[PDB]
Design a binder for this molecule. Structure first.
Ligand SMILES: [K+]
Ligand SMILES: [K+]
Ligand SMILES: [K+]
Ligand SMILES: [K+]
Ligand SMILES: [K+]
Ligand SMILES: [K+]
Ligand SMILES: [K+]
Ligand SMILES: [K+]
Ligand SMILES: [K+]
Ligand SMILES: [K+]
Ligand SMILES: [Mg+2]
Ligand SMILES: [Mg+2]
Ligand SMILES: [Mg+2]
Ligand SMILES: [Mg+2]
Ligand SMILES: [Mg+2]
Ligand SMILES: [Mg+2]
Ligand SMILES: [Mg+2]
Ligand SMILES: [Mg+2]
Ligand SMILES: [Mg+2]
Ligand SMILES: [Mg+2]
Ligand SMILES: [Mg+2]
Ligand SMILES: [Mg+2]
Ligand SMILES: [Mg+2]
Ligand SMILES: [Mg+2]
Ligand SMILES: [Mg+2]
Ligand SMILES: [Mg+2]
Ligand SMILES: [Mg+2]
Ligand SMILES: [Mg+2]
Ligand SMILES: [Mg+2]
Ligand SMILES: [Mg+2]
Ligand SMILES: [Mg+2]
Ligand SMILES: [Mg+2]
Ligand SMILES: [Mg+2]
Ligand SMILES: [Mg+2]
Ligand SMILES: [Mg+2]
Ligand SMILES: [Mg+2]
Ligand SMILES: [Mg+2]
Ligand SMILES: [Mg+2]
Ligand SMILES: [Zn+2]
Lengths: 147, 53, 118, 49, 101, 111
RNA sequence: GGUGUAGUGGUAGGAGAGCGUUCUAAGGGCGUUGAAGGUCGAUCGUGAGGACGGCUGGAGCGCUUAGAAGUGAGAAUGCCG
RNA sequence: UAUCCGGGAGUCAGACUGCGAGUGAUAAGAUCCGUAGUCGAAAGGGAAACAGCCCAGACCACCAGCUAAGGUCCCAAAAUA
RNA sequence: UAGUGAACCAGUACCGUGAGGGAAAGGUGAAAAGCACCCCGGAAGGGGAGUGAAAUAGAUCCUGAAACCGUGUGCCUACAACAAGUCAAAGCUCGUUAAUGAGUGAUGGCGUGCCUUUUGUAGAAUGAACCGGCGAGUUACGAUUGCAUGCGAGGUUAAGUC
């Protein structure tokens, strides 16, 4: 009968969640956040429409890195100039720019397309326990069981 | 060196996007009112800056 | 008895072009390119008439999983519980209930959880 | 009989098979000659015996 | 109020006054038809069939028999000088739902 | 009854170059078109000017329309018959030459 | 014609059955109240393909049975435009 | 299903994989045999992509269900069992 | 593009020192009634006005396809990596052989052209610039097999005459 529900843009209300990264493995935090951002947690999920929720990640500076990742997990990036390979350790990124660390982790998990990037734009990472989005009245999201 | 592939109509039109003329500096002649190029003698009345020449 | 080309060739090529209407430039203008594209169009259409069922079952599975999580269960547990409870509702209907009739989906989930407990 | 109702006896006349007239006919392209070789050429094939 | 009926190897949501397309039913147009495999009845309250709701039925009238738009299956293997074209029109029966029980 | 057309057929000029000029005048008042064509130095400018003046003359004499209100509603160039020529290139070969022609049409309406 | 069982990927290639084109014979028709041809359309058949409407066009052409073939093009660094 | 009789062929460049040998260096996506499979002539699922490996043989329609190999944190369906 | 190379001032034009080679090119309309006259323009060519059933039949003249070019726009498009499509699809526009309609289409999934030849080709192996036309298992005489008809331990004429 071709009656499967297909969500539309704008008709779905996107809510705001706050996720605390304190002592949570980077990958597991990224996985739960990516699921929420894509909207896999709601029955109205539609692959070709953005239906996920906004996420504010706090205390990113305290994200957990098991094993020796703090010094051994290396993030590479190439300027595209010859010999232009630059590398930074996960520990250094966590200490200096944790926002970038979390954003890279979540990007690696989101789809690599226009919809994926638009969903990525809904992610806000803040080292520390304070964020400027009180106006959005975000609700805390417990993730101890989800991880 | 020769075109490996023929240029499509869309690509040809895109390249020609900037292949166009322009008409600039036309304004009313103070003497007869006919349009003229600024800083040029009006070809109609032969005046320029309010004097016949 | 000479049989010249006639109009059959034009008719056939025009049929191909009409099938090719809506393609990019030469792919709808030229007969050869149109036929080449139309053949690939047939190939993709035949393969997609199979892939479509896969895709919609996948979507229903995802939505049912989300609803089960909201009801405190995983998709696999919910389906096992429904099978034990002797419910034959399929994934299309379950996803439709999950989206539209949350109360009905919750009742189904409660029955599945009861069956799992038993 | 009537000239406008002619009908041959069944199986008396068959339709000639024409090769090289499309693939679906079963004799397109190679015309049933196979691929290359002497027998695939015009006027090809060896003398009897 | 609505129901879910198991028809033609598939399950269809049905409401009174709505028309549903199903696999060809061997029933003449304009005649009454009854679906007895009702797996759920929803609305104000929900009735769950295990697998079928006990004694539930859905009554409809066959509005029309028809054929869906043509589907072309064109199977070919590139470079193998081999293609096969086939047409199809899947018969369907449109049923207007009169009563849900 | 409200619009008049003029056409110059088989004019010896490049259709693309003629279109370059035509794009200027298309959709503008008759006075603006006349000024633009007069002060445009491109070869096709004079030919388009003659065609436009002929169109205005028709819209006035034949249909007694208001010249002062006229606007160039439509104007285009179409490819015409192409004369074939040959230019002898190096090493004894010849190269074809397409001497192209234009059909210039200008339609001017009351408003 | 119904029921049941089983089967229906396919190159070389074998077998069978059909679509379409020109012309011929017979019959039966259609055409300045508009044929063929061209163009557009959301039409029908399992396929090749077959109608039906609008516009253009201006004088020939379908249908049924049978018959004969210069009978079907997308490629040959094919030929001509 | 085998035989036999007759009409019509195409085929005589094979490839890899497993197992048993030779040549080779107990090298080769090597070469040459035996044996089985697949490709050849086989689409579909898995192995990222990937003819020859694993599962499995497409007559079609479905916005139905159960499984194979392989998998169930996100990309990406299913256990943060 | 057939039919003589030649339907037409063709063995011509043209090519070659020469022998020799060798084209292209038919169609207004029933009847020229082949657009008097006026307007723009130097003319060409157009717009009227007329002839005509028809002039989008105006001499490049029956029809007028495709490649190709242009004009106007219903929809989409300037963060996107696209064998160009197919499946799913919001939105916008429009209403047909009235059909669970049509055009476009953000966005998401899947997805390396056709042919030839190869063990194997998306192939960085070959061929095609595109469109149109033409272009390849035929005929004659015999051999043999299947099928069909006639006759049947028989069958049958050939040349030739009317
Ligand atoms: K053969
Ligand atoms: K028609
Ligand atoms: K060719
Ligand atoms: K045999
Ligand atoms: K082996
Ligand atoms: K005419
Ligand atoms: K357009
Ligand atoms: K797509
Ligand atoms: K290759
Ligand atoms: K080469
Ligand atoms: Mg032909
Ligand atoms: Mg399946
Ligand atoms: Mg014969
Ligand atoms: Mg074959
Ligand atoms: Mg071929
Ligand atoms: Mg060959
Ligand atoms: Mg060979
Ligand atoms: Mg051979
Ligand atoms: Mg010289
Ligand atoms: Mg099969
Ligand atoms: Mg004819
Ligand atoms: Mg032929
Ligand atoms: Mg080898
Ligand atoms: Mg082979
Ligand atoms: Mg395969
Ligand atoms: Mg292959
Ligand atoms: Mg299962
Ligand atoms: Mg998943
Ligand atoms: Mg675990
Ligand atoms: Mg000739
Ligand atoms: Mg006309
Ligand atoms: Mg004409
Ligand atoms: Mg960006
Ligand atoms: Mg954009
Ligand atoms: Mg090789
Ligand atoms: Mg070679
Ligand atoms: Mg080439
Ligand atoms: Mg060609
Ligand atoms: Zn002046």
């Amino acid at each position: 009968m071709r009656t499967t529900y297909m969500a539309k843009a704008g008709e779905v209300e996107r809510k705001w969640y706050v996720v605390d990264a304190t002592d949570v493995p980077l990958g597991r935090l990224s996985a739960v956040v990516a699921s929420v951002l894509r909207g896999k947690n709601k029955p109205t999920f539609t692959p070709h429409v953005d239906t996920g929720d906004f996420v504010i990640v706090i205390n990113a500076d305290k994200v957990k890195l098991t094993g020796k990742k703090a010094t051994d997990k290396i993030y590479y990036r190439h300027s595209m100039y010859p010999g232009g390979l630059k590398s930074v350790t996960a520990g250094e990124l966590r200490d200096k720019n944790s926002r970038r660390l979390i954003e890279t982790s979540v990007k690696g998990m989101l789809p690599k397309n226009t919809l994926g990037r638009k969903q990525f734009t809904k992610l806000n990472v803040y080292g520390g326990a304070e964020h400027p989005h009180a106006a959005q009245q975000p609700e805390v999201l417990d993730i101890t069981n989800l991880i | 060196a020769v075109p490996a592939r023929r240029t499509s109509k869309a690509k040809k039109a895109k390249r020609r996007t900037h292949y166009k003329l322009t008409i600039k500096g036309l304004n009313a002649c103070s003497n007869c009112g006919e349009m003229k190029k600024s800083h040029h003698v009006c070809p109609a009345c032969g005046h320029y800056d309010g004097k016949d020449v | 008895a000479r049989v010249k080309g006639g109009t059959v060739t034009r008719k056939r090529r025009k049929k191909v072009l009409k099938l090719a209407k809506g393609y990019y430039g030469s792919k709808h203008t030229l007969f050869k390119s149109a036929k080449e594209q139309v053949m690939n169009s047939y190939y993709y259409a035949f393969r997609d008439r199979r892939q479509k069922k896969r895709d919609f079952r996948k979507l229903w599975i995802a939505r049912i999983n989300a609803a089960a999580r909201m009801n405190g269960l995983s998709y696999s547990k919910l389906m096992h519980g429904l099978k034990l409870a002797e419910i034959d509702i399929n994934r299309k209907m379950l996803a439709d209930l999950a989206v539209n009739d949350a109360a009905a989906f919750t009742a189904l989930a409660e029955q599945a959880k009861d069956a799992l407990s038993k | 009989m009537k000239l406008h109702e002619l009908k041959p006896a069944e199986g008396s006349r068959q339709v000639r098979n024409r090769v090289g007239r499309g693939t679906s006919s079963g004799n397109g392209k190679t015309a049933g000659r196979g691929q290359k070789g002497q027998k695939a050429r015009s006027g090809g094939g060896v003398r009897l015996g | 109020m609505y129901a879910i009926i198991k028809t033609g190897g598939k399950q269809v949501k049905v409401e009174v006054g709505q028309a549903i397309y199903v696999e060809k039913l061997n029933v003449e147009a304009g005649e009454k038809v009854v679906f007895d495999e009702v797996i759920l009845v929803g609305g104000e309250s929900t009735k769950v069939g295990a697998p079928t709701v006990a004694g539930a039925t859905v009554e409809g009238t066959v509005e029309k028999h028809g054929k869906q738009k043509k589907v072309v299956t064109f199977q070919y293997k590139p470079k193998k000088h081999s293609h096969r074209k086939q047409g199809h029109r899947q018969p369907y029966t449109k049923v207007m739902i009169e009563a849900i029980n | 009854i409200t619009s008049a057309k003029a056409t110059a057929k088989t004019v010896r000029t490049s259709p693309r170059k003629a279109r370059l000029v035509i794009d200027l005048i298309r959709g503008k008042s008759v006075a603006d078109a006349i000024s633009i064509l007069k002060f445009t130095p491109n070869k096709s400018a004079g030919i388009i000017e003659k065609v436009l003046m002929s169109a205005v003359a028709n819209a006035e004499n034949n249909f007694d329309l208001d010249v002062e209100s006229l606007v160039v509603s439509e104007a285009f160039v179409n490819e015409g018959p192409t004369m074939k020529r040959f230019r002898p290139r190096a090493k004894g070969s010849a190269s074809p030459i397409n001497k192209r022609t234009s059909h210039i049409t200008v339609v001017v309406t009351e408003k």
